[PDB]
Amino acid sequence: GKEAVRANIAAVKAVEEALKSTYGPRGMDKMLVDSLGDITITNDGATILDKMDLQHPAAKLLVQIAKGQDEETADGTKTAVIFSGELVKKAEDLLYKDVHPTIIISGYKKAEEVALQTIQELAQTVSINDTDLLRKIAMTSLSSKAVAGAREYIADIVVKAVTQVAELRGDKWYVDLDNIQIVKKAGGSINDTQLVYGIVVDKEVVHPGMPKRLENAKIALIDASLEVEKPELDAEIRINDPTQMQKFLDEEENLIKEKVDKILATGANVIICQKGIDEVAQSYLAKKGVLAVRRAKKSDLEKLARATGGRVVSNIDEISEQDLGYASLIEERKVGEDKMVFVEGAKNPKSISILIRGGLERLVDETERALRDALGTVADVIKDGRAIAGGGAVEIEIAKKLRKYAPQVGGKEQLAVEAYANALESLVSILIENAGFDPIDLLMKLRSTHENENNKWYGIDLYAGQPVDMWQKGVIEPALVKMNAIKAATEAATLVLRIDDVVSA
Amino acid sequence: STHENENNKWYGIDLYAGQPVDMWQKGVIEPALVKMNAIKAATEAATLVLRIDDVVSA
Amino acid sequence: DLQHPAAKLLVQIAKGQDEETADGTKTAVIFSGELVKKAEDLLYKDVHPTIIISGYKKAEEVALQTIQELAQTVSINDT
Ligand SMILES: Nc1ncnc2c1ncn2[C@@H]1O[C@H](COP(=O)(O)OP(=O)(O)OP(=O)(O)O)[C@@H](O)[C@H]1O
Ligand SMILES: Nc1ncnc2c1ncn2[C@@H]1O[C@H](COP(=O)(O)OP(=O)(O)OP(=O)(O)O)[C@@H](O)[C@H]1O
Ligand SMILES: [Mg+2]
Ligand SMILES: [Mg+2]
């Protein structure tokens, strides 16, 4: 009976009330204070559920199906929880009316069916030629981010960045996002961001008298040191005579000139490593006419290997012409007071990098977050091909469409369907609420102007406050993220109904 | 009232005389950037407090 | 010594300055809390914070430009 079922529903209603004010734009941020007293203002759905201790089994089970994703995007997480907890909310009112859950499941399952298929016979075909569209869909992701510093600048980048990487695979475009590096240098201006055609290494060339820009680079990616190593690294030496000393530390220093001659044996003109270059070896490279980089991050040597077609060499006695990385031109370039190596004209044409400049020290990170996400949304639309209008449009229709279905479904199962439709309008009602307008007024002004096909892309513009076309204001979203979120969400909702008892050991 | 005309823009308040006067023409002049970064500082904080809905703690 | 999150957050935005000499630091705190104070009086009339933020923002604008289109040019030879 009532026994355990309340506790589950209650636990869920609780989580809903924790995120409610933060759904869509105009959302009212939450403050999170750590155990050592450190403060975080945010609206990240995920963290707020993860970072919490939920006593109840029920909540964690619901957030487990809601939060997650098995694809390379992280969008739909606030809608997934909320629509789910509203569906749980709306189901209680049927248990009050004395409708068994076996009926509510069959009703909602049948409603969900039609509700799913109404995104299929409505989604719009978006391909690679619609680059004037990805610009919009992109901005639609960045616009509710914290930073308002030149987002058009960044929105344009995300398009160029995904369309460059786009490869025709199995007669359909695919995008392997890993072909994009992100480097950030705080300050200057956000307007100074640009896209680099090639991998970018954040360290300098070890002597400025080497070539500024070197022609037809035969790079040598060297993992092993090019500096002497210690005979006293763990503990002190056992030599007693300095003549014996000498001949040790002498032959080990001729071992680096040996390594340098083994690398130039290959015809290398530039050389990058992740360990040192001895000062007698900088001097050795200066006299030969070679361009050397000392202690660069191996994390970007890896990324520079499969971009220039070279190999990250762990033994200087194994380097071959085969292993030298090729690039049309390598140079060192200055950014304020810092200098990085850039390697344009690399053999892999898909491998590119983004250089962020501007903002404050923590804001620049969030600009990187936003860009990760923005590349995501655009890539995932491309990978799919389908995209619907945001702003509650496709939602309001699945409600209207469900309500027309309701009569025909049967007795009690009509009320299930009619509830499902009501839970879906409640979503847009929360969104309207959080804008500071009346949910009923606007819900009705819209759901009457949505009966004819002429108004398919009508939603509610969260700053105007009256029904308009969101498609023609750039507010579009991935048709499949908002499709797997609903499937996920209903699964969870009805799982909360499935529980007759909880037995704890 | 004595600042209604545009000619009396540099009017402020005499802190010893105690009467509205033109401070430019009395030697009390100040860096124009300080009373500008103050305003940006203050509104950021202001608008940010209003942005907090509720508090969670460890 | 403040443990209230909001106060610690406030003092951080107000006190700190990214330039060598620091002035306006008393002004910064009073005007901030006053902007917060005078906003309370609108909340009391049931007005929602998203309006008050956008209201103030549009005002911050006018307020900023009103210092620019008015300052007098001082140089190395105005000793
Ligand atoms: N300017 C706008 N006017 C109207 N609706 C908007 C606007 N911008 C976005 N929306 C709608 O707001 C809805 C909810 O936004 P949000 O993206 O915050 O929910 P979410 O996708 O579940 O959260 P997250 O993106 O963090 O996972 C979106 O699905 C979108 O259609
Ligand atoms: N005799 C005076 N007549 C008019 N105003 C005066 C006079 N002396 C001081 N002032 C005004 O006093 C104001 C406030 O000074 P104060 O420096 O204490 O504020 P603050 O700059 O916020 O504090 P701090 O400099 O420590 O950060 C100045 O902006 C200045 O114009
Ligand atoms: Mg989203
Ligand atoms: Mg002062």
XYZ file of C-alpha atoms and ligand atoms in Angstrom:
706
model
C 0.000 0.000 0.000
C 0.908 3.755 0.672
C 3.863 2.549 2.830
C 7.021 2.812 0.699
C 5.493 4.582 -2.350
C 5.274 7.964 -0.719
C 8.938 8.000 0.312
C 10.031 7.370 -3.394
C 7.641 10.052 -4.820
C 8.544 12.493 -1.963
C 12.352 11.935 -2.592
C 11.844 12.681 -6.274
C 9.561 15.832 -5.629
C 12.486 17.038 -3.435
C 15.085 16.841 -6.240
C 12.650 18.701 -8.589
C 12.402 21.607 -6.102
C 16.239 21.734 -6.061
C 16.675 22.563 -9.765
C 13.213 24.301 -10.717
C 14.491 28.000 -10.580
C 17.480 27.247 -12.836
C 15.804 25.831 -15.961
C 16.555 27.726 -19.328
C 17.606 31.449 -19.584
C 16.913 33.892 -16.666
C 17.603 30.903 -14.203
C 18.525 31.843 -10.638
C 21.945 30.420 -9.793
C 22.680 28.144 -6.719
C 25.574 28.718 -4.209
C 27.677 25.775 -3.137
C 29.923 25.922 -0.111
C 32.654 23.225 0.381
C 33.815 21.515 3.554
C 36.931 23.759 3.864
C 34.678 26.878 3.244
C 35.298 27.459 -0.512
C 32.487 29.054 -2.536
C 31.042 28.222 -5.921
C 28.138 30.036 -7.697
C 26.696 27.878 -10.457
C 23.838 26.294 -12.422
C 25.466 23.114 -13.543
C 22.604 20.403 -13.251
C 24.967 17.543 -12.889
C 27.266 18.800 -9.976
C 24.293 19.760 -7.922
C 23.100 16.081 -7.960
C 26.489 14.488 -7.916
C 27.974 16.615 -5.047
C 24.861 15.851 -2.902
C 24.225 12.998 -0.489
C 20.854 11.403 -1.294
C 19.660 9.079 1.551
C 16.844 7.765 -0.534
C 17.398 4.954 -3.145
C 14.649 6.390 -5.233
C 16.245 9.785 -6.035
C 19.658 8.237 -7.032
C 17.888 5.783 -9.327
C 15.958 8.623 -10.948
C 19.154 10.909 -11.328
C 21.068 7.827 -12.701
C 18.714 7.539 -15.672
C 18.171 11.270 -16.058
C 21.681 12.861 -15.738
C 23.781 10.573 -17.939
C 24.425 10.341 -21.677
C 26.150 7.539 -23.882
C 27.154 10.046 -26.547
C 29.737 12.895 -26.797
C 27.445 15.678 -25.480
C 26.261 16.771 -22.050
C 23.059 18.732 -23.066
C 19.428 18.123 -21.864
C 20.340 17.413 -18.239
C 18.078 19.950 -16.497
C 15.096 19.134 -18.854
C 15.614 15.262 -18.341
C 15.352 15.619 -14.493
C 12.500 18.129 -14.458
C 10.167 16.600 -17.083
C 10.737 13.297 -15.264
C 9.950 14.622 -11.819
C 6.918 16.472 -13.261
C 5.748 13.119 -14.758
C 6.162 11.492 -11.289
C 4.309 14.580 -9.849
C 1.454 14.262 -12.389
C 1.197 10.444 -11.747
C 0.390 10.871 -8.052
C -2.898 12.651 -9.010
C -3.979 9.345 -10.828
C -3.061 7.232 -7.638
C -5.376 9.728 -5.803
C -8.104 8.970 -8.298
C -7.629 5.329 -7.779
C -6.012 4.406 -11.090
C -3.680 1.366 -10.795
C 0.029 2.046 -12.119
C -0.412 -0.816 -14.686
C -2.810 1.422 -16.482
C -0.683 4.717 -16.084
C 2.354 2.808 -17.598
C 0.380 1.580 -20.636
C -1.071 5.089 -21.152
C 2.214 7.006 -20.835
C 4.008 4.247 -23.014
C 1.432 4.750 -25.807
C 1.724 8.656 -25.420
C 5.492 8.507 -25.409
C 5.297 6.563 -28.748
C 3.384 9.319 -30.606
C 5.378 11.977 -28.644
C 8.618 10.455 -30.019
C 7.398 10.036 -33.598
C 6.162 13.710 -33.621
C 9.896 14.759 -33.482
C 10.662 12.432 -36.464
C 7.864 13.826 -38.828
C 8.936 17.471 -38.062
C 12.766 17.612 -37.725
C 14.567 19.669 -40.335
C 17.415 18.427 -42.564
C 20.648 20.116 -41.606
C 23.789 19.280 -43.601
C 27.274 20.836 -44.007
C 26.109 23.420 -46.691
C 23.879 25.081 -44.065
C 26.946 26.933 -42.553
C 24.718 30.022 -42.265
C 22.584 27.845 -39.912
C 25.368 26.275 -37.737
C 26.211 29.854 -36.852
C 22.882 30.234 -35.249
C 22.618 26.794 -33.542
C 26.103 27.555 -32.061
C 25.145 30.984 -30.664
C 22.063 29.360 -29.166
C 24.465 27.310 -26.933
C 26.883 30.090 -26.066
C 24.183 32.834 -25.272
C 23.269 31.444 -21.788
C 26.845 31.103 -20.752
C 28.338 33.481 -18.138
C 30.701 35.324 -20.381
C 29.164 37.861 -22.827
C 32.542 38.958 -24.333
C 32.155 38.700 -28.229
C 30.286 35.449 -28.690
C 29.725 35.917 -32.408
C 33.582 35.715 -32.669
C 33.583 32.311 -30.934
C 30.231 31.136 -32.644
C 31.842 31.663 -36.115
C 34.990 29.570 -34.929
C 32.925 26.583 -33.838
C 31.438 26.357 -37.372
C 34.741 26.639 -39.240
C 36.272 24.167 -36.679
C 33.616 21.369 -37.156
C 33.135 21.782 -41.005
C 37.055 21.546 -41.430
C 37.165 18.254 -39.668
C 33.976 16.911 -41.425
C 34.854 13.688 -43.415
C 32.355 11.856 -45.582
C 32.034 8.439 -43.856
C 29.595 5.597 -45.156
C 27.827 8.177 -47.386
C 27.079 10.557 -44.345
C 29.249 13.284 -42.688
C 31.118 12.396 -39.449
C 33.249 14.472 -37.126
C 36.007 13.161 -34.825
C 36.219 16.149 -32.360
C 39.666 14.957 -31.062
C 41.220 16.735 -34.186
C 40.844 20.113 -32.345
C 43.349 21.472 -29.696
C 42.422 24.302 -27.363
C 45.040 26.772 -26.053
C 44.190 29.841 -23.909
C 46.167 32.863 -23.012
C 44.460 35.157 -20.502
C 43.901 38.800 -21.459
C 44.262 40.925 -24.656
C 40.720 40.643 -26.024
C 38.159 37.888 -26.865
C 37.924 39.596 -30.301
C 41.546 38.340 -30.926
C 40.573 34.655 -31.008
C 41.407 32.741 -34.285
C 41.622 29.268 -35.745
C 45.020 27.748 -36.457
C 45.504 25.303 -39.380
C 47.910 22.984 -37.415
C 49.099 21.873 -33.972
C 50.516 24.449 -31.437
C 53.279 23.708 -28.871
C 53.425 25.977 -25.716
C 57.217 26.389 -25.313
C 59.987 28.297 -27.117
C 62.963 27.628 -29.396
C 65.971 27.116 -27.120
C 68.213 29.723 -28.795
C 66.902 32.815 -30.620
C 69.756 32.836 -33.293
C 68.298 29.675 -35.073
C 65.802 30.238 -37.894
C 62.652 32.256 -37.069
C 60.702 30.263 -39.636
C 62.364 27.034 -40.985
C 61.511 25.671 -44.517
C 60.117 22.017 -45.148
C 60.487 20.759 -41.523
C 61.693 17.228 -40.779
C 60.776 17.295 -37.119
C 62.218 14.922 -34.597
C 59.861 14.225 -31.650
C 62.441 12.950 -28.936
C 61.092 11.491 -25.682
C 64.670 10.457 -24.158
C 66.864 13.221 -22.542
C 69.343 15.351 -24.565
C 70.988 16.493 -21.145
C 73.343 14.484 -18.943
C 71.808 12.454 -16.034
C 73.161 11.995 -12.522
C 75.473 9.360 -11.055
C 74.315 10.617 -7.639
C 70.450 10.552 -8.290
C 69.539 8.132 -5.457
C 72.632 8.597 -3.237
C 76.254 9.878 -3.277
C 79.136 8.478 -5.578
C 81.693 5.662 -4.660
C 84.545 7.179 -6.707
C 87.436 8.415 -4.430
C 89.642 9.796 -7.195
C 88.639 12.842 -9.300
C 90.472 11.375 -12.375
C 87.980 8.422 -12.269
C 85.088 11.015 -11.804
C 86.116 13.041 -14.759
C 86.186 10.137 -17.276
C 82.574 9.232 -16.114
C 81.046 12.700 -16.473
C 83.105 13.313 -19.594
C 81.798 10.137 -21.533
C 78.255 10.861 -20.416
C 78.565 14.439 -21.868
C 79.971 13.048 -25.196
C 76.826 10.721 -25.051
C 74.596 13.835 -25.633
C 76.697 15.019 -28.562
C 76.330 11.369 -29.656
C 72.499 11.562 -29.418
C 72.536 14.853 -31.379
C 74.683 13.293 -34.119
C 72.351 10.212 -34.098
C 69.310 12.539 -34.621
C 70.976 14.632 -37.444
C 71.983 11.258 -39.048
C 68.339 11.183 -40.032
C 68.439 14.645 -41.759
C 66.420 16.348 -39.052
C 66.315 20.236 -39.221
C 64.066 20.698 -36.200
C 63.999 18.846 -32.935
C 61.535 18.918 -30.114
C 61.922 17.103 -26.818
C 60.233 16.742 -23.322
C 63.412 16.575 -21.274
C 66.460 18.851 -21.297
C 69.063 19.894 -24.015
C 72.546 20.393 -22.443
C 74.145 23.890 -22.759
C 76.991 22.256 -24.700
C 74.272 20.593 -26.803
C 72.443 23.974 -27.478
C 75.850 25.117 -28.596
C 76.179 21.994 -30.763
C 72.788 22.754 -32.464
C 73.642 26.447 -32.858
C 76.719 25.605 -34.828
C 75.072 23.017 -37.127
C 72.015 25.298 -38.057
C 69.265 23.210 -36.353
C 66.051 24.503 -34.615
C 65.694 23.081 -31.164
C 62.914 23.139 -28.488
C 63.768 22.007 -24.964
C 61.188 20.571 -22.510
C 57.893 20.849 -24.434
C 54.742 18.978 -23.087
C 54.622 15.434 -24.281
C 50.695 15.783 -24.235
C 51.093 18.007 -27.312
C 54.011 16.023 -28.884
C 51.495 13.178 -29.163
C 48.910 15.460 -30.846
C 51.824 16.774 -33.135
C 53.007 13.294 -34.120
C 49.698 12.173 -35.832
C 49.332 15.665 -37.362
C 52.787 15.806 -39.080
C 52.999 12.009 -39.595
C 55.988 11.632 -37.280
C 56.620 9.373 -34.280
C 57.435 10.013 -30.663
C 60.952 8.559 -30.440
C 61.864 6.719 -27.144
C 65.230 5.575 -28.356
C 67.499 7.893 -30.226
C 69.044 4.628 -31.856
C 65.615 3.899 -33.462
C 64.818 7.209 -35.245
C 64.409 6.812 -38.964
C 63.302 9.038 -41.999
C 59.990 7.329 -41.503
C 59.672 8.727 -38.013
C 60.557 12.373 -38.803
C 57.453 14.595 -38.750
C 56.807 16.579 -41.891
C 55.377 20.073 -42.026
C 55.432 22.609 -44.859
C 56.803 25.392 -42.451
C 57.507 25.497 -38.614
C 58.117 28.858 -36.966
C 58.138 30.550 -33.424
C 55.544 33.218 -32.924
C 55.002 35.811 -30.156
C 51.813 36.368 -28.143
C 52.292 39.458 -25.748
C 55.524 38.475 -23.808
C 55.289 34.648 -24.502
C 56.498 32.774 -27.521
C 55.047 29.377 -28.762
C 56.012 27.149 -31.740
C 53.357 26.861 -34.445
C 53.400 24.104 -37.144
C 51.218 24.985 -40.018
C 51.159 22.997 -43.221
C 51.095 19.719 -41.514
C 50.191 16.503 -43.469
C 46.998 15.817 -41.636
C 44.641 18.484 -42.964
C 41.868 17.704 -40.284
C 44.188 18.398 -37.234
C 43.625 22.071 -36.166
C 43.813 24.198 -33.037
C 41.871 27.134 -31.464
C 43.682 29.995 -29.674
C 41.549 31.738 -27.071
C 42.710 35.177 -25.776
C 40.940 37.653 -23.428
C 38.930 37.474 -20.141
C 39.965 36.880 -16.406
C 41.637 33.851 -14.891
C 38.516 31.837 -14.065
C 36.243 33.335 -16.754
C 38.716 32.105 -19.517
C 38.166 28.545 -18.220
C 34.430 28.938 -18.508
C 34.948 30.256 -21.958
C 36.728 27.036 -22.700
C 33.872 25.047 -21.118
C 31.365 26.849 -23.311
C 33.483 26.247 -26.402
C 33.754 22.429 -25.630
C 30.054 22.300 -25.335
C 29.443 24.526 -28.461
C 31.743 22.365 -30.634
C 29.675 19.439 -29.127
C 26.216 20.701 -29.985
C 27.178 21.559 -33.593
C 29.093 18.290 -34.120
C 26.255 16.184 -32.749
C 23.684 17.985 -35.121
C 26.036 17.268 -38.011
C 26.555 13.642 -36.912
C 22.834 13.366 -36.813
C 21.308 15.716 -39.496
C 18.223 16.669 -37.768
C 17.324 19.869 -35.840
C 14.113 21.311 -34.404
C 13.062 24.711 -33.167
C 13.716 25.424 -29.436
C 11.586 27.728 -27.300
C 8.993 25.105 -26.320
C 7.751 24.650 -29.939
C 8.009 20.920 -30.452
C 6.844 20.383 -26.779
C 3.689 22.386 -27.000
C 2.773 20.466 -30.119
C 3.396 16.973 -28.485
C 0.994 18.145 -25.780
C -1.724 19.475 -28.250
C -1.174 16.229 -30.396
C -1.504 13.982 -27.216
C -4.643 15.767 -26.095
C -6.260 15.034 -29.590
C -5.229 11.423 -29.224
C -6.694 11.168 -25.660
C -10.363 10.561 -26.510
C -9.514 7.664 -28.802
C -7.114 5.718 -26.412
C -9.839 4.318 -24.149
C -11.235 4.828 -20.681
C -8.696 5.399 -17.974
C -5.714 5.403 -20.352
C -7.016 8.720 -21.801
C -6.380 10.394 -18.360
C -2.816 8.938 -18.456
C -2.255 10.489 -21.927
C -3.949 13.808 -20.843
C -1.680 13.917 -17.714
C 1.491 13.245 -19.917
C 0.383 16.248 -22.085
C -0.225 18.331 -19.009
C 3.292 17.443 -17.619
C 4.785 18.517 -20.884
C 3.058 22.033 -20.853
C 4.162 22.355 -17.171
C 7.741 22.362 -18.382
C 7.185 25.405 -20.520
C 5.073 26.823 -17.623
C 8.223 26.557 -15.278
C 10.274 28.202 -18.053
C 7.682 31.068 -18.326
C 7.490 31.292 -14.494
C 11.318 31.798 -14.264
C 11.025 34.608 -16.868
C 8.583 36.458 -14.625
C 5.386 36.161 -16.770
C 2.026 34.325 -16.098
C 2.248 30.594 -17.102
C -1.517 30.297 -18.012
C -1.793 33.409 -20.219
C 1.166 32.532 -22.396
C 0.509 28.781 -22.444
C -3.003 29.476 -23.816
C -1.973 32.341 -26.315
C 0.384 29.797 -27.728
C -1.582 26.479 -27.651
C -4.419 28.235 -29.601
C -2.151 29.637 -32.373
C -0.486 26.187 -32.717
C -3.536 24.283 -34.254
C -2.531 24.992 -37.951
C 0.572 23.762 -39.660
C 1.522 27.525 -40.486
C 2.860 27.957 -36.955
C 5.005 24.808 -36.482
C 8.149 26.711 -35.228
C 6.250 28.988 -32.800
C 7.492 29.016 -29.223
C 7.803 31.752 -26.570
C 10.747 34.103 -26.817
C 11.908 34.311 -23.157
C 12.499 38.143 -23.316
C 9.641 39.209 -25.692
C 6.803 37.234 -23.888
C 4.300 36.373 -26.678
C 4.298 33.539 -29.347
C 6.818 33.971 -32.277
C 8.877 31.855 -34.575
C 12.058 30.698 -32.772
C 13.533 29.065 -35.887
C 13.583 32.597 -37.396
C 15.438 33.985 -34.373
C 18.193 31.340 -34.593
C 16.926 29.301 -31.573
C 17.290 25.732 -32.891
C 18.388 22.521 -31.111
C 19.519 18.890 -31.787
C 16.341 16.869 -32.583
C 17.846 13.585 -31.006
C 19.233 14.935 -27.627
C 15.680 16.219 -26.863
C 14.421 12.741 -27.993
C 16.667 10.379 -25.901
C 16.194 12.742 -22.924
C 12.409 12.163 -23.023
C 12.871 8.383 -23.423
C 15.318 8.364 -20.528
C 13.049 10.675 -18.444
C 9.817 8.474 -18.970
C 11.780 5.371 -18.141
C 12.769 6.820 -14.910
C 9.334 8.250 -14.104
C 7.551 4.944 -14.628
C 10.354 3.090 -12.721
C 9.389 5.191 -9.673
C 5.700 3.821 -10.147
C 7.016 0.274 -10.582
C 8.152 0.001 -6.942
C 5.652 -1.733 -4.654
C 8.095 -2.236 -1.761
C 11.811 -1.479 -0.771
C 13.397 -3.979 1.623
C 16.651 -2.756 3.235
C 19.062 -5.232 4.797
C 18.788 73.321 -8.086
C 22.087 75.103 -8.527
C 23.136 72.189 -10.861
C 20.025 72.558 -13.192
C 22.014 74.636 -15.699
C 24.805 72.739 -17.668
C 27.283 75.598 -16.646
C 27.063 74.269 -13.034
C 28.015 70.552 -13.796
C 31.223 70.580 -11.657
C 29.089 71.363 -8.572
C 29.605 69.400 -5.508
C 29.374 69.836 -1.777
C 31.802 72.008 0.220
C 32.731 69.802 3.348
C 33.930 72.741 5.464
C 31.856 75.674 4.062
C 28.799 73.612 3.821
C 26.985 74.880 0.612
C 26.845 73.592 -3.047
C 29.865 74.887 -5.108
C 31.944 74.219 -8.276
C 34.654 71.935 -7.100
C 36.774 72.155 -10.255
C 37.075 75.888 -9.634
C 38.103 75.234 -5.908
C 40.980 72.753 -6.426
C 39.055 69.493 -5.476
C 39.639 67.477 -8.642
C 40.028 63.618 -8.870
C 41.164 60.713 -11.246
C 38.063 60.050 -13.502
C 38.897 56.356 -13.714
C 38.627 55.608 -9.975
C 34.921 56.766 -9.802
C 34.391 54.537 -12.896
C 36.072 51.210 -11.862
C 34.208 51.652 -8.496
C 30.836 51.641 -10.351
C 31.776 48.535 -12.356
C 33.038 46.789 -9.183
C 29.875 47.672 -7.108
C 27.275 46.702 -9.869
C 29.053 43.327 -10.513
C 28.861 42.409 -6.884
C 25.267 43.879 -6.608
C 23.901 42.081 -9.594
C 25.715 38.886 -8.520
C 24.141 38.735 -5.053
C 20.707 38.965 -6.688
C 21.647 36.083 -8.958
C 22.058 33.726 -5.912
C 18.811 31.734 -5.346
C 19.729 29.457 -2.409
C 22.823 28.109 -0.669
C 24.070 24.517 -0.418
C 26.801 23.484 2.016
C 29.035 20.609 2.752
C 35.578 37.484 10.091
C 32.561 36.644 7.895
C 31.157 33.112 7.444
C 28.043 34.103 5.354
C 28.966 33.214 1.692
C 27.529 36.446 0.252
C 29.560 38.812 2.560
C 32.894 37.016 1.754
C 32.018 37.216 -1.965
C 31.118 40.868 -1.608
C 34.379 41.939 0.171
C 36.411 40.070 -2.428
C 34.870 42.085 -5.366
C 35.012 45.306 -3.429
C 38.610 45.355 -1.640
C 40.781 43.921 -4.425
C 42.161 46.044 -7.192
C 44.252 45.037 -10.196
C 46.032 48.425 -10.328
C 49.158 49.591 -8.292
C 47.583 52.328 -6.192
C 43.990 51.707 -4.982
C 41.290 54.350 -4.386
C 37.406 54.327 -4.315
C 37.634 51.197 -1.950
C 35.204 52.748 0.741
C 33.020 54.120 -2.130
C 32.980 50.595 -3.792
C 31.585 48.984 -0.657
C 28.952 51.727 0.349
C 27.522 52.153 -3.287
C 27.474 48.356 -3.628
C 25.426 47.759 -0.501
C 23.247 50.727 -1.255
C 22.524 49.305 -4.779
C 21.608 46.068 -2.899
C 19.659 48.060 -0.286
C 17.579 50.169 -2.832
C 16.929 46.849 -4.758
C 15.409 45.322 -1.589
C 12.757 48.033 -1.677
C 11.649 46.833 -5.163
C 11.531 43.111 -4.040
C 9.281 44.214 -1.217
C 6.842 45.482 -4.059
C 6.978 41.931 -5.482
C 9.167 42.827 -8.411
C 11.357 39.858 -9.577
C 15.280 40.172 -9.580
C 15.689 39.527 -13.362
C 14.091 42.950 -13.990
C 16.142 44.715 -11.323
C 19.399 43.254 -12.804
C 18.416 44.284 -16.419
C 17.150 47.738 -15.052
C 20.428 48.346 -13.276
C 22.432 47.122 -16.290
C 20.758 49.581 -18.674
C 21.419 52.273 -15.918
C 25.130 51.148 -15.498
C 25.481 51.866 -19.202
C 24.191 55.476 -19.045
C 26.113 55.944 -15.841
C 29.421 54.802 -17.471
C 29.089 56.941 -20.629
C 28.217 59.965 -18.507
C 31.754 59.842 -17.027
C 33.505 59.386 -20.474
C 31.716 62.156 -22.425
C 32.625 64.688 -19.644
C 36.259 64.259 -18.257
C 38.990 67.047 -18.908
C 42.292 66.228 -20.521
C 45.339 66.485 -18.161
C 48.937 65.810 -19.491
C 52.663 65.971 -18.564
C 52.662 69.721 -19.011
C 49.662 70.599 -16.862
C 51.903 70.632 -13.752
N 16.155 32.768 -25.850
C 15.478 31.640 -25.662
N 14.110 31.845 -25.695
C 13.365 30.769 -25.455
N 13.712 29.510 -25.129
C 15.047 29.429 -25.065
C 16.022 30.369 -25.352
N 17.309 29.854 -25.198
C 17.084 28.568 -24.941
N 15.747 28.229 -24.808
C 15.171 26.936 -24.417
O 15.426 26.682 -23.043
C 15.465 25.237 -22.829
C 16.148 24.731 -21.560
O 17.572 25.099 -21.537
P 18.737 24.323 -20.947
O 19.658 24.114 -22.155
O 19.281 25.167 -19.887
O 18.001 23.054 -20.394
P 19.005 21.819 -20.488
O 19.402 21.575 -21.990
O 18.127 20.709 -19.981
O 20.137 22.248 -19.426
P 21.636 21.900 -20.039
O 21.724 22.625 -21.417
O 22.579 22.553 -19.047
O 21.751 20.419 -20.067
C 16.182 24.713 -24.119
O 15.919 23.350 -24.474
C 15.843 25.837 -25.172
O 14.957 25.467 -26.209
N 36.988 69.303 1.396
C 36.420 68.462 0.530
N 35.356 68.947 -0.198
C 34.702 68.117 -0.984
N 34.807 66.753 -1.077
C 35.872 66.325 -0.453
C 36.770 67.112 0.300
N 37.795 66.252 0.813
C 37.421 65.078 0.456
N 36.401 65.066 -0.426
C 35.730 63.923 -1.099
O 35.740 62.879 -0.327
C 35.442 61.688 -1.138
C 35.644 60.388 -0.435
O 37.014 60.103 -0.082
P 37.637 58.634 0.233
O 38.982 58.601 -0.384
O 37.571 58.444 1.713
O 36.590 57.707 -0.445
P 37.228 56.390 -0.932
O 38.091 56.883 -2.071
O 36.057 55.530 -1.214
O 38.121 55.739 0.305
P 39.568 55.202 -0.142
O 40.307 56.337 -0.808
O 40.224 54.869 1.135
O 39.304 53.984 -1.008
C 36.359 62.015 -2.341
O 35.798 61.405 -3.503
C 36.538 63.524 -2.338
O 35.967 64.168 -3.460
Mg 20.619 22.611 -22.897
Mg 39.750 57.759 -1.815
